[PDB]
Amino acid sequence: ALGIKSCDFQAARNNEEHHTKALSSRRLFVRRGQPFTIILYFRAPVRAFLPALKKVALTAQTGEQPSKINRTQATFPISSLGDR
Amino acid sequence: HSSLETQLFCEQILEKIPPDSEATLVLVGRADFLEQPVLGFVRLQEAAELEAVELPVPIRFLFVLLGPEAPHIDYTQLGRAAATLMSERVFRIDAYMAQSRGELLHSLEGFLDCSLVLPPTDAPSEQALLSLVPVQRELLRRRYQ
Amino acid sequence: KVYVELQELVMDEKNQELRWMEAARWVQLEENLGENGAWGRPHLSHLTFWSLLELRRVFTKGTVLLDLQETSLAGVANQLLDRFIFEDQIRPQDREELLRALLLKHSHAGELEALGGVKPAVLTRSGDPSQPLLPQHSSLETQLFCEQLEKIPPDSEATLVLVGRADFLEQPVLGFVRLQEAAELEAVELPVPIRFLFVLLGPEAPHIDYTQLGRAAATLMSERVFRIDAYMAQSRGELLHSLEGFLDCSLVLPPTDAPSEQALLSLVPVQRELLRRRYQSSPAKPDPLQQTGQLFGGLVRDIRRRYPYYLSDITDAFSPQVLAAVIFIYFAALSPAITFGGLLGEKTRNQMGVSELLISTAVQGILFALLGAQPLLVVGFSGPLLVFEEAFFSFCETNGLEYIVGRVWIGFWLILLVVLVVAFEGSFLVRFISRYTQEIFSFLISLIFIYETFSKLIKIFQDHPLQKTYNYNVLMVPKPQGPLPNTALLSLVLMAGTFFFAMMLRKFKNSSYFPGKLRRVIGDFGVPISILIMVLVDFFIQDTYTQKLSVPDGFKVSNSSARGWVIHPLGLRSEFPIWMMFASALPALLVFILIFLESQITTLIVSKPERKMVKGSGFHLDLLLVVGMGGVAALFGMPWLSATTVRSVTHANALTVMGKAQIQEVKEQRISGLLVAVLVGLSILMEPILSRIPLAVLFGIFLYMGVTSLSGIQLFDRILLLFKPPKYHPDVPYVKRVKTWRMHLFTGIQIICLAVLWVVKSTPASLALPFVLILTVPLRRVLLPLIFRNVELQCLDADDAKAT
Amino acid sequence: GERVQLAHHFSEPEITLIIFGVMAGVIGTILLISYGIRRL
Ligand SMILES: CCCCCCCC(=O)OC[C@H](COP(=O)(O)O[C@@H]1[C@H](O)[C@H](O)[C@@H](OP(=O)(O)O)[C@H](OP(=O)(O)O)[C@H]1O)OC(=O)CCCCCCC
Ligand SMILES: CCCCCCCCCCCC(=O)OC[C@H](COP(=O)(O)OCC[N+](C)(C)C)OC(=O)CCCCCCCCCCC
Ligand SMILES: CC(C)CCC[C@@H](C)[C@H]1CC[C@H]2[C@@H]3CC=C4C[C@@H](O)CC[C@]4(C)[C@H]3CC[C@]12C
Ligand SMILES: CC(C)CCC[C@@H](C)[C@H]1CC[C@H]2[C@@H]3CC=C4C[C@@H](O)CC[C@]4(C)[C@H]3CC[C@]12C
Ligand SMILES: *[C@@H]1O[C@H](CO)[C@@H](O)[C@H](O)[C@H]1NC(C)=O
């Protein structure tokens, strides 16, 4: 019941906040160390928010061979206790 | 007078639009003060959601066709031709990578090269139309290869 | 209609001499001349956009000689070139070489093979032709219509279109000539006078193909409106005005990457309106489960659907896959025949036995292959028919009734019942049997088949237990009178070996090893190869006993003292009572429901849309044939048969050609089933061959068929999905559009139905299985929508596997 | 047939012909009845 319909990266707003609006309004360009906002859309209404939050993690990878030791891959949960 | 397409198809979208789809806007109008008809072709650097013209998908291409009343010039039909040209895969790909008007004109010539004209025939319509199936298939055997 | 001929200036191959050669001709419809020397298939003319664009350009500045008083090509060309110069279209220095080109020899199709063929040529200031410099494009009309004259009316007049290329020309030129009186020229061999002359000369230029230019001019002349205008035009402008209307009513079809018939037929109103516009100014005027409400309508439509394919039903069997399927289904239909015939002879005191079942199966299969609308069905005895035979025998022995005569009367009632059902199109009730009942029945039947094969192996083990000591001097006639060493273990080894070899060859068919065609062949004969290997294995072990196939000694009744080949309906030894002649309808009723359900559900399963059967299936003809043949065979003391599910599914699977995971086509033909039936009939005379075939090999074959018949059942797939995690679940509509627990509730309800039917089959009241199976139709149609949405039912219970 | 059998007045072809005739008669009766209905 946690299917994903779409994810909006909000390229215009984030690029405005991250001083990359001159680059594009469609591609997400962000600068490290500063938060950016995305919107996750679900196919069905989410009944219980906390178990669903416990059920989801995010992974960011860069390069052809991403790994933790190279710091080219990070897996982090979606929670208010995350290291900002 | 009413357009032929309206008379034969109108007297009696977002679901079908693919997700990574970009819009082409064709603008057609008659201006009696212009000496000659003019064509404008615009490829935006990136697809844009023009606030003045809200479309189901962001606009990538703009066709502007303006001019006066001229012999053999139907501007609605001229816009229909430019729209069909955009709908064709090979010209659309050429339009995305075009860097000059000459490359666009070369693609239009190939579009005209692989175009079939059915003359006025007295045959039954279902036979006259279906007779184009093998001729068009042979004519497009290399265009989409 | 008029005759239009198009000739192009070309140079030959033997003497390199330029000349005029006809490239196409028009009598309304256009014929083209191929390189071989024969005329292609006539077709409606289609023009390139560039040919019409250039034709309009040359015609606008063209040269018109209307009502010209000349009767020879020399006279026309002299005047045409004289006004060409006067119109400043060609220079006077060009007149000499252009006149030389025009009055040349005009060859026709009778000398293409006599000469060395033609190649395109461009006229030079020198007499010798120049080789064309622009890139050559082979004619589309020749490739599409050519690589493989009485229609001219007596009063009709001809038109000659001449196209030629000359490098010494500034621009292409059009000359239009209308003679005062239609005259015969040496250019046209046909005895039709010429009125019009199109001359299209010019240099090699981009977007100009002079063959297409001539085709456009000839198509324009072939049009009725322009030709009438051409006859009545006294100036160039009137011809120009008619050309503009021709282009105004033309339909340009742009290229598309996804052509289709339906999108093309969306232009039918456009083509009709354009033709109406063209003629508005000219004086001419433009020239299998449905119920039909008719008696025997379903039967007649069933015949008309399939009988035209009779020629293909013989020729499509000329493939080794069909022979391998014959070898497969021969054993698959012969071993159950022997087993059921032996059980019938044991129960009915040999009144109906092995030979009767064999001959009935042979005759009915031959007739069904020759006359059935779905020849892929296998017709033979089944379990429920055996249960009915035992029940009727018990009833007849209870009240002192002759069993075979009661069978005769049951068949007599069956004929009436099937005639009434077919005459009222009663087979349209089959449409209420959705995927639910079909898959439940197929899964239950496959499970029963597997269970019975394993039970036969178990019974072999019980008859020959593994023990420390054995009696060695045991009697061997007619069967083991005691336990034997190495018998059960060798039966297990043979069954496992043949099943393993069959599965290995099945995977070899889909594997990537060996030449693919050889692998496809070897894989097609996989079951015969496994059978032969294990038969040889048992052959080379001589000391050990294994039970072998046993066929009747000859074509004789199974019990000589009880009955003959023909049964008297009034009685054999005692008079048959009057009341049973009428009371035979109720057992005939039950037999009719059994056979109807089995045969029609088998037809539904085999002829599913996803199985890629394009030849059609008849639900009225096959039921009539099967039940009528059973009713007739009852009069001869023979069993009534039915279209069994496992055998028919195996027969269809053995004729299925796989694509490159996806079903491509099925070899639907009448020869495979006919040969299986003939071999079943001939099996009595094949005793020295069948006596060396062990039953364990056939048991492994049965296990293979049982595990194979589950491939196309969505119920089995969903049962697997029960043991399979949701993330793994495949991309199918009943997974992606239905919740996983809802899908599993659907599967669990189907499982409960399967358990209920299995329990019913386990009781002596196993003849009520058709009615309980029927009860699953009110289930799906009433109770399932009370707990499932319409979307969920469309996704799960889909007729053609569609996502609603 | 076989062995010793009771001799009826009708032979097997005669009895099966009369039964086929009776069946054809009742079939025609039902067909004519169905043709009468759905029309009036
Ligand atoms: C049994 C042969 C005995 C070996 C004799 C030694 C000679 C011998 O058989 O090898 C040469 C020959 C090469 O010929 P080639 O490559 O043209 O033959 C290909 C082969 O038939 C494939 O099976 C085909 O694929 P598929 O399956 O139809 O899809 C493929 O067609 P396509 O589909 O790609 O267009 C064919 O092109 O065969 C082999 O392919 C190597 C396998 C060796 C076979 C060895 C098996 C033990
Ligand atoms: C893919 C191919 C098939 C694979 C499955 C193998 C099943 C083999 C049949 C076993 C059940 C059976 O039949 O056992 C039942 C028999 C019979 O017992 P009974 O007391 O004589 O019967 C009583 C009935 N009376 C009174 C009429 C005699 O037990 C035995 O003799 C015990 C020996 C069993 C040998 C098992 C062989 C190894 C199996 C494991 C292989 C992986
Ligand atoms: C649908 C089929 C089975 C027909 C229905 C059976 C009934 C209606 C008919 C068919 C043939 C009939 C029999 C034909 C001939 C005779 C001989 C006569 O001296 C006594 C009655 C008797 C024995 C008839 C009784 C009724 C009968 C049994
Ligand atoms: C015991 C074996 C044979 C079958 C058991 C499978 C059943 C109990 C399991 C397998 C997959 C499971 C489903 C997987 C995912 C979801 C989505 C979740 O948001 C609600 C529950 C639901 C819908 C589960 C319900 C229970 C389920 C259907
Ligand atoms: C054949 O029928 C007779 C008499 O009807 C019976 O005695 C005999 O047992 C039967 N034969 C067999 C093999 O059952």
Short mmCIF file of all heavy atoms in Angstrom, two decimals, chain C residues 635-671, unseen atoms left out:
data_model
loop_
_atom_site.label_atom_id
_atom_site.label_comp_id
_atom_site.label_asym_id
_atom_site.label_seq_id
_atom_site.Cartn_x
_atom_site.Cartn_y
_atom_site.Cartn_z
N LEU C 635 -25.35 -48.56 -30.09
CA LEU C 635 -26.08 -49.60 -30.81
C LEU C 635 -25.18 -50.75 -31.22
O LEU C 635 -25.67 -51.88 -31.39
CB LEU C 635 -26.77 -48.98 -32.04
CG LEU C 635 -27.38 -49.88 -33.11
CD1 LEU C 635 -28.80 -50.29 -32.73
CD2 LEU C 635 -27.38 -49.18 -34.46
N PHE C 636 -23.88 -50.52 -31.36
CA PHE C 636 -22.93 -51.55 -31.72
C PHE C 636 -22.20 -52.13 -30.51
O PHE C 636 -21.20 -52.83 -30.68
CB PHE C 636 -21.91 -51.01 -32.73
CG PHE C 636 -22.45 -50.84 -34.12
CD1 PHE C 636 -23.41 -49.88 -34.40
CD2 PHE C 636 -22.03 -51.66 -35.15
CE1 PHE C 636 -23.91 -49.72 -35.67
CE2 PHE C 636 -22.53 -51.52 -36.43
CZ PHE C 636 -23.47 -50.54 -36.69
N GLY C 637 -22.69 -51.87 -29.31
CA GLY C 637 -22.03 -52.34 -28.10
C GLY C 637 -20.68 -51.71 -27.87
O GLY C 637 -19.74 -52.40 -27.44
N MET C 638 -20.55 -50.41 -28.13
CA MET C 638 -19.30 -49.68 -28.05
C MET C 638 -19.48 -48.48 -27.13
O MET C 638 -20.59 -47.94 -27.02
CB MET C 638 -18.84 -49.22 -29.44
CG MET C 638 -18.88 -50.31 -30.49
SD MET C 638 -17.25 -50.94 -30.91
CE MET C 638 -17.03 -50.16 -32.51
N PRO C 639 -18.42 -48.04 -26.46
CA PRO C 639 -18.55 -46.92 -25.53
C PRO C 639 -18.79 -45.60 -26.24
O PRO C 639 -18.30 -45.37 -27.35
CB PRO C 639 -17.21 -46.91 -24.78
CG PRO C 639 -16.56 -48.21 -25.11
CD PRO C 639 -17.06 -48.60 -26.45
N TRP C 640 -19.54 -44.72 -25.59
CA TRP C 640 -19.60 -43.32 -26.00
C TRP C 640 -18.42 -42.58 -25.40
O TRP C 640 -18.09 -42.76 -24.22
CB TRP C 640 -20.91 -42.67 -25.58
CG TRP C 640 -21.39 -43.05 -24.23
CD1 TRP C 640 -20.86 -42.69 -23.03
CD2 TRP C 640 -22.53 -43.87 -23.93
NE1 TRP C 640 -21.58 -43.24 -22.00
CE2 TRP C 640 -22.61 -43.97 -22.53
CE3 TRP C 640 -23.47 -44.54 -24.71
CZ2 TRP C 640 -23.61 -44.70 -21.89
CZ3 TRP C 640 -24.46 -45.26 -24.08
CH2 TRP C 640 -24.51 -45.35 -22.68
N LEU C 641 -17.77 -41.76 -26.21
CA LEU C 641 -16.53 -41.10 -25.81
C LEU C 641 -16.79 -39.63 -25.54
O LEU C 641 -17.92 -39.14 -25.61
CB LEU C 641 -15.46 -41.29 -26.88
CG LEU C 641 -15.34 -42.70 -27.46
CD1 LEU C 641 -14.49 -42.67 -28.71
CD2 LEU C 641 -14.75 -43.65 -26.44
N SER C 642 -15.71 -38.92 -25.23
CA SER C 642 -15.78 -37.49 -24.96
C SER C 642 -14.43 -36.87 -25.30
O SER C 642 -13.41 -37.56 -25.37
CB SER C 642 -16.15 -37.21 -23.49
OG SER C 642 -15.93 -35.85 -23.16
N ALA C 643 -14.44 -35.56 -25.51
CA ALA C 643 -13.22 -34.81 -25.76
C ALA C 643 -12.51 -34.62 -24.43
O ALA C 643 -12.86 -33.73 -23.65
CB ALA C 643 -13.52 -33.48 -26.44
N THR C 644 -11.52 -35.46 -24.15
CA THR C 644 -10.80 -35.39 -22.89
C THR C 644 -9.92 -34.14 -22.83
O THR C 644 -9.47 -33.62 -23.85
CB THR C 644 -9.95 -36.64 -22.69
OG1 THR C 644 -9.42 -37.06 -23.95
CG2 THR C 644 -10.79 -37.76 -22.10
N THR C 645 -9.68 -33.67 -21.61
CA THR C 645 -8.96 -32.41 -21.43
C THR C 645 -7.45 -32.59 -21.55
O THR C 645 -6.79 -31.84 -22.28
CB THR C 645 -9.32 -31.80 -20.07
OG1 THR C 645 -10.73 -31.58 -20.00
CG2 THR C 645 -8.60 -30.47 -19.89
N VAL C 646 -6.89 -33.57 -20.85
CA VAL C 646 -5.44 -33.72 -20.81
C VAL C 646 -4.90 -34.11 -22.18
O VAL C 646 -3.90 -33.54 -22.65
CB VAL C 646 -5.03 -34.75 -19.73
CG1 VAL C 646 -3.64 -35.28 -19.99
CG2 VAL C 646 -5.07 -34.11 -18.36
N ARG C 647 -5.55 -35.07 -22.84
CA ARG C 647 -5.07 -35.51 -24.15
C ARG C 647 -5.18 -34.40 -25.19
O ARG C 647 -4.26 -34.21 -26.00
CB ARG C 647 -5.85 -36.75 -24.59
CG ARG C 647 -5.39 -38.02 -23.89
CD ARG C 647 -6.11 -39.25 -24.41
NE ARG C 647 -6.95 -39.88 -23.40
CZ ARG C 647 -8.27 -39.93 -23.44
NH1 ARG C 647 -8.95 -39.39 -24.44
NH2 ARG C 647 -8.93 -40.53 -22.45
N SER C 648 -6.28 -33.65 -25.19
CA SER C 648 -6.44 -32.57 -26.16
C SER C 648 -5.46 -31.44 -25.89
O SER C 648 -4.90 -30.85 -26.82
CB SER C 648 -7.87 -32.04 -26.14
OG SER C 648 -8.81 -33.10 -26.27
N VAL C 649 -5.23 -31.11 -24.61
CA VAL C 649 -4.27 -30.06 -24.27
C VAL C 649 -2.86 -30.47 -24.68
O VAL C 649 -2.10 -29.67 -25.23
CB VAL C 649 -4.37 -29.73 -22.77
CG1 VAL C 649 -3.08 -29.08 -22.27
CG2 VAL C 649 -5.55 -28.81 -22.51
N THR C 650 -2.50 -31.74 -24.44
CA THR C 650 -1.20 -32.23 -24.87
C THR C 650 -1.07 -32.22 -26.39
O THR C 650 -0.01 -31.89 -26.93
CB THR C 650 -0.97 -33.65 -24.33
OG1 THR C 650 -1.40 -33.71 -22.96
CG2 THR C 650 0.49 -34.03 -24.42
N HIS C 651 -2.15 -32.58 -27.09
CA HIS C 651 -2.13 -32.57 -28.55
C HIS C 651 -1.95 -31.16 -29.10
O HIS C 651 -1.20 -30.95 -30.05
CB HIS C 651 -3.43 -33.19 -29.08
CG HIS C 651 -3.44 -33.41 -30.56
ND1 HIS C 651 -4.54 -33.15 -31.34
CD2 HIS C 651 -2.49 -33.89 -31.39
CE1 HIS C 651 -4.26 -33.45 -32.60
NE2 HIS C 651 -3.02 -33.90 -32.66
N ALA C 652 -2.63 -30.18 -28.50
CA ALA C 652 -2.47 -28.80 -28.93
C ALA C 652 -1.08 -28.26 -28.58
O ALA C 652 -0.50 -27.49 -29.35
CB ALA C 652 -3.55 -27.92 -28.30
N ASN C 653 -0.54 -28.66 -27.43
CA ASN C 653 0.78 -28.21 -27.02
C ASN C 653 1.87 -28.79 -27.91
O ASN C 653 2.88 -28.13 -28.19
CB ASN C 653 1.03 -28.58 -25.56
CG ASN C 653 0.38 -27.62 -24.59
OD1 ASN C 653 -0.24 -26.63 -25.00
ND2 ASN C 653 0.50 -27.91 -23.30
N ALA C 654 1.69 -30.03 -28.37
CA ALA C 654 2.68 -30.66 -29.22
C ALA C 654 2.69 -30.08 -30.63
O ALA C 654 3.65 -30.30 -31.37
CB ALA C 654 2.45 -32.17 -29.28
N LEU C 655 1.65 -29.35 -31.00
CA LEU C 655 1.57 -28.69 -32.30
C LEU C 655 1.81 -27.19 -32.20
O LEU C 655 1.67 -26.48 -33.20
CB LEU C 655 0.21 -28.95 -32.95
CG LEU C 655 -0.12 -30.43 -33.20
CD1 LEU C 655 -1.62 -30.62 -33.33
CD2 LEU C 655 0.60 -30.94 -34.43
N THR C 656 2.17 -26.69 -31.02
CA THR C 656 2.41 -25.26 -30.83
C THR C 656 3.85 -24.91 -31.15
O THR C 656 4.78 -25.57 -30.67
CB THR C 656 2.07 -24.87 -29.39
OG1 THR C 656 0.70 -25.17 -29.11
CG2 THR C 656 2.32 -23.39 -29.16
N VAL C 657 4.04 -23.87 -31.96
CA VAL C 657 5.36 -23.37 -32.32
C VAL C 657 5.66 -22.16 -31.45
O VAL C 657 4.89 -21.19 -31.45
CB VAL C 657 5.45 -23.02 -33.81
CG1 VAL C 657 6.89 -23.05 -34.28
CG2 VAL C 657 4.59 -23.97 -34.63
N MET C 658 6.76 -22.20 -30.71
CA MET C 658 7.12 -21.13 -29.80
C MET C 658 7.97 -20.08 -30.51
O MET C 658 8.76 -20.39 -31.40
CB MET C 658 7.89 -21.67 -28.60
CG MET C 658 7.48 -21.04 -27.28
SD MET C 658 5.90 -21.66 -26.67
CE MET C 658 6.42 -23.21 -25.92
N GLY C 659 7.78 -18.82 -30.11
CA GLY C 659 8.51 -17.71 -30.67
C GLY C 659 9.84 -17.48 -29.96
O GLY C 659 10.30 -18.28 -29.15
N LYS C 660 10.45 -16.35 -30.29
CA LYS C 660 11.74 -15.98 -29.71
C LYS C 660 11.58 -14.84 -28.71
O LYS C 660 10.47 -14.38 -28.44
CB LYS C 660 12.73 -15.58 -30.80
N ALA C 661 9.00 -18.35 -25.39
CA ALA C 661 8.44 -17.55 -24.30
C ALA C 661 7.07 -17.01 -24.67
O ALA C 661 6.24 -16.73 -23.80
CB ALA C 661 9.39 -16.42 -23.94
N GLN C 662 6.83 -16.86 -25.97
CA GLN C 662 5.57 -16.35 -26.49
C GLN C 662 5.07 -17.28 -27.59
O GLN C 662 5.85 -17.73 -28.43
CB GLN C 662 5.74 -14.92 -27.02
CG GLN C 662 4.78 -14.53 -28.14
CD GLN C 662 5.11 -13.18 -28.74
OE1 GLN C 662 5.75 -12.34 -28.10
NE2 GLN C 662 4.67 -12.96 -29.97
N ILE C 663 3.77 -17.58 -27.56
CA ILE C 663 3.17 -18.46 -28.55
C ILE C 663 3.16 -17.77 -29.91
O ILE C 663 2.69 -16.63 -30.04
CB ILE C 663 1.75 -18.87 -28.12
CG1 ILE C 663 1.75 -19.30 -26.65
CG2 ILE C 663 1.20 -19.94 -29.04
CD1 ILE C 663 2.14 -20.75 -26.43
N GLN C 664 3.67 -18.46 -30.93
CA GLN C 664 3.72 -17.90 -32.27
C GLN C 664 2.58 -18.42 -33.14
O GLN C 664 1.79 -17.64 -33.68
CB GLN C 664 5.08 -18.20 -32.91
CG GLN C 664 5.25 -17.65 -34.31
CD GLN C 664 6.04 -18.57 -35.22
OE1 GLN C 664 5.89 -19.79 -35.16
NE2 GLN C 664 6.89 -17.99 -36.06
N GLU C 665 2.47 -19.74 -33.29
CA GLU C 665 1.38 -20.34 -34.05
C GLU C 665 1.22 -21.79 -33.62
O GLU C 665 2.10 -22.38 -32.99
CB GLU C 665 1.62 -20.24 -35.56
CG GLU C 665 2.97 -20.77 -36.01
CD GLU C 665 2.98 -21.17 -37.47
OE1 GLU C 665 2.82 -20.28 -38.33
OE2 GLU C 665 3.16 -22.37 -37.76
N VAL C 666 0.08 -22.37 -33.99
CA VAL C 666 -0.21 -23.78 -33.78
C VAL C 666 -0.49 -24.42 -35.13
O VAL C 666 -1.22 -23.85 -35.95
CB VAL C 666 -1.41 -23.99 -32.83
CG1 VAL C 666 -1.45 -25.42 -32.33
CG2 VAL C 666 -1.33 -23.03 -31.66
N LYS C 667 0.10 -25.59 -35.36
CA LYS C 667 -0.16 -26.34 -36.59
C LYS C 667 -1.53 -27.00 -36.53
O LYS C 667 -1.64 -28.18 -36.21
CB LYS C 667 0.93 -27.39 -36.81
CG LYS C 667 2.06 -26.93 -37.72
CD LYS C 667 3.31 -26.63 -36.93
CE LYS C 667 4.56 -26.82 -37.77
NZ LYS C 667 5.80 -26.53 -37.00
N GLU C 668 -2.58 -26.23 -36.83
CA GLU C 668 -3.94 -26.75 -36.79
C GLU C 668 -4.22 -27.50 -38.09
O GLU C 668 -4.31 -26.90 -39.16
CB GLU C 668 -4.94 -25.61 -36.59
CG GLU C 668 -4.48 -24.56 -35.61
CD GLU C 668 -5.37 -23.33 -35.61
OE1 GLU C 668 -6.56 -23.45 -35.26
OE2 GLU C 668 -4.87 -22.24 -35.97
N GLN C 669 -4.36 -28.82 -37.99
CA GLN C 669 -4.55 -29.67 -39.15
C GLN C 669 -5.34 -30.91 -38.73
O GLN C 669 -5.49 -31.20 -37.55
CB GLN C 669 -3.22 -30.05 -39.80
CG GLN C 669 -2.06 -30.16 -38.82
CD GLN C 669 -2.15 -31.40 -37.95
OE1 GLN C 669 -2.30 -32.51 -38.45
NE2 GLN C 669 -2.05 -31.21 -36.65
N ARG C 670 -5.84 -31.63 -39.73
CA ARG C 670 -6.66 -32.81 -39.50
C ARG C 670 -5.89 -34.12 -39.61
O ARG C 670 -6.46 -35.18 -39.36
CB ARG C 670 -7.83 -32.84 -40.49
CG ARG C 670 -8.78 -31.67 -40.36
CD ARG C 670 -9.79 -31.66 -41.49
NE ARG C 670 -10.78 -30.60 -41.31
CZ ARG C 670 -11.82 -30.67 -40.49
NH1 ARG C 670 -12.04 -31.74 -39.74
NH2 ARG C 670 -12.65 -29.64 -40.40
N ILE C 671 -4.61 -34.06 -39.97
CA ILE C 671 -3.88 -35.30 -40.25
C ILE C 671 -3.35 -35.94 -38.98
O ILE C 671 -3.31 -37.17 -38.87
CB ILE C 671 -2.76 -35.02 -41.27
CG1 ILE C 671 -3.36 -34.49 -42.58
CG2 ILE C 671 -1.93 -36.26 -41.54
CD1 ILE C 671 -4.44 -35.38 -43.15
#
